[PDB]
Amino acid sequence: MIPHSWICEKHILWLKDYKNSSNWKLFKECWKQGQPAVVSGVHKKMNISLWKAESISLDFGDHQADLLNCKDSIISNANVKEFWDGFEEVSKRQKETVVLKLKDWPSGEDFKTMMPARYEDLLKSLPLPEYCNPEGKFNLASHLPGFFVRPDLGPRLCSAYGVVAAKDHDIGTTNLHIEVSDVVNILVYVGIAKGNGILSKAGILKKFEEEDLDDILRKRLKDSSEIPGALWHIYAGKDVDKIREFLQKISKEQGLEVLPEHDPIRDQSWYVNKKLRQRLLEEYGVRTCTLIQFLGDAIVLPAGALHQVQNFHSCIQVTEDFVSPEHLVESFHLTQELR
Template identity: 35%
Template sequence: METDSNANTPRSDASIQPTALLSLDTNGFINATENSTSDSSINNNNKRLLDSSASSEQVLIKRRNKLLEPTIVTQQNYCLSYPNNISRCIDCQTASPNDFAMHLTGCRFQHCRTLKYFGDNTYEFEGFTTSIDWQAPDPETLTTPNSSGQPPLNILDANFIFKHIARLFCLMFQHEQSERSTYDDKSIIRKKYMAGWREVCDECLTTLFNCHYMCKQCGYMICIDCSKQLVYLSVEQKRKSKRFCPHNDSFCLAEFIPWDHLLKLRSSVIDHLSKLKIDYSIKLYNSSRAENLSTFIKTLKMKRSHEARDIQKVWSSIDSNNDPNIEFYCNGRLPVFNEWTSENANHVFQKVWSTGCPVLVRQVHHKLSKTLWLPSAFKEHMIDHRETPALYDCETLSPIATDESILTKFWDGFERLNVRLRDEENGGRQRILKLKDWPTKKDFASVFPTLLHDLMNNIPFSDYTRRSYTYENVEYHGGPMNIVERLPSCLVKPDLGPKLYIAYSQLGSQAQKKAGTTNLHIDVSDAVNVLVYVGIGGYGDDGSDNEDEIRQVEAEILQSNIDEPQLQRLRNGERPGALWHLFRSDDAKKIREYVGRAHRKAAGSDTIHDQTAYLEKEDLDKLRDWSKVESYPMLQFLGDAVFIPSGAPHQVKNLHSCIKIAEDF
């Protein structure tokens, strides 16, 4: 019989089992180790282990702390993939965790925020990536020439485009360089450019070029110009701001494109400008820090004011090289092209368009396939299409719930007044309906491939206006001057259309509030609007009793300050569809001020971008007399294409029911 030296408990030899020693592994955890050594060696081993430290608990803590030294990682997923202690960006705050696809490219902090990783899905905020520690590759196509795959430009077109955009690029570079000068590279957030995602300023919704400010708590982004305006807001103004970000002191400068890439690009641009003997020395104008407008915006405005003399030019036959196919409306201010394929027509268009002057092109409908653009064709296609278009009431500016029945009645009433929808909640008035921006969610090429092909083959000045598309397995390239087609392939190109705009005559409106078919507004892109069909509304089963609407239209035209050449077209039997009023982009400020006073707009609203104002004849007369602002009153007849420069305020009133197709470029 043996005796246990520790407990003095007798036991038989048969009961002896291997003894488990307690030991600490390298990770600080207690492990059991089988051992068949003698009791005395067990005792000695444990004694040595305990004597090697003040206590086993201290050893355990030390080993565990060694394990928990964090690893610095870059946030690869959307914020919702991380524990709740990691702050969410504004996109992730408002989205469902199940909305996986959107967040893979939509999260503000993805690929630019760094986290401390402790293992076992435990994270803490660490910081943000900078150009110094940046390792992720950028899309190669971001800086690769002609990654869009368009045909090479000839040297004349290339130099023409280059001289117009290169100086602007140098100005933008200087603008951003000035902003960066107060920071070092270690403090500027370097964000990965996400292919297929458009980054915009959350204040003004303008696409961001490169440098901008980002809130480190929620990812709210503002452009440099908006940041200048926000700096000088009072506490009360900031409190009343509609911004979604309350963290006024958490903004940090951020950029998408490595600055050394832009330095190299600017050097190449300057070299080529020098070879072309084009002055690139652009000085930023000094401006008081109390002003809301940034230095950059002020520079552009002063530059535009200097060039405004060309925009106000009264054109003559000398400017058209005495071309009999080019005439001028609006007392010589509006160039009108009766033909657009000749070399001289393209030369004159390029000259007048570069000044920011609107242009009218006649007789486009004669080139189109007539049967494709009839109301019956659109009615059949839209009713069969899965995406039901949204209809709007022109008088209330509100959408109308649309189904197949409502859409059928809309088309049945296109030229038949007695079957039009009525607003039973407001005395049964006849609704003035419009269908705009259609297709709203899909590319026109996928919904109307044949119409697009017909339009692109016949659209005026196609070097500027033609877009790329595929038709019957044949790829067609965009026009050489349509520079959106030459954006890097990784960028999200804006949806420039074309889009359909279909609406009734506005002359039958019974509303007290002034409203147009399209109220006063501004587009950020150049655009062309083609009137492809004009329908005269009448009574009777077939709408043939239409004399009343014709008389109304003639009366409206005669009191709208339309000049003689346009009135002659009416007398010659051409069918007018819409009345346009366009303004120079430089007059936008004066127009805003007038609308704000005359229409009593609320402070803080944009009197043009709100699209709630329509200027009637008395408004236009007051603008001319008080502010020296004169519009381009223009009749759009069947087949006319109106070219609208970007930034030019304009409004439209349908005289008859119209089908128009518009494309930005």
């Protein structure tokens, strides 16, 4: 047997054993319906020390990059060194402190070449390797001619503060967006921030518990060996048009001026907060799947799926693109629309 459960009223397959070599056989049956999957325990496969903030900060801290304020998506005056200093030290953050993100750094070929050991560890550790590994039999990514695949097909590193210190749970560390290709998202480090009156690890666990959760998720949360990092909301790709209309309607309501051809999904300008998700369900019938991503959880999303993320703790995520047959058509079309 293949240990598994379902989360979110059958939308998401939870594969419970990263070591089970037949995971793909069950995944295949759920993927073909456009269901996401999450594989827990991948950090146990990884060289987890390579992915700690202290290690990534030391190895790559001298390179300059833009830091984003997640509240308004305005590039910050902070440098990479100031970003990493504030990763777990709230007092070293600039002011109410800001939620910073170091996005896609490094990414694509630079990831493979500048972090070769981490890239090697990633390849070794990718779950569902039949799909997710470049040499997997169902992965078309390295076989397709160039124009079928996005130009930025690569691994990505994403590091960001949690929103808890700012006490602003209207902030997304990743705004609502659509996935142009199949993708696996792995939480490889969770950092507990300290200072300036921030909620503690335990106060933050209670914050997670106050969310509307599936019973299966509440159980994981009681488990002291699991470290919850980030709150995810995931939407079925079939709901993309309704969500876009909902956001355009909210935009008009708040008097938020827009261009005529205004596409809030493409803009990636929204974090759909609790009150808004409730209105989205009531007014358009669109259901939210809620996931808490724990350290070592790999979330696997098909092309066309939408999601947003809200780090509670400081988090480092590594994502990897792949191209399954199942969603190639959708992926190609979304890829072309990206022009």
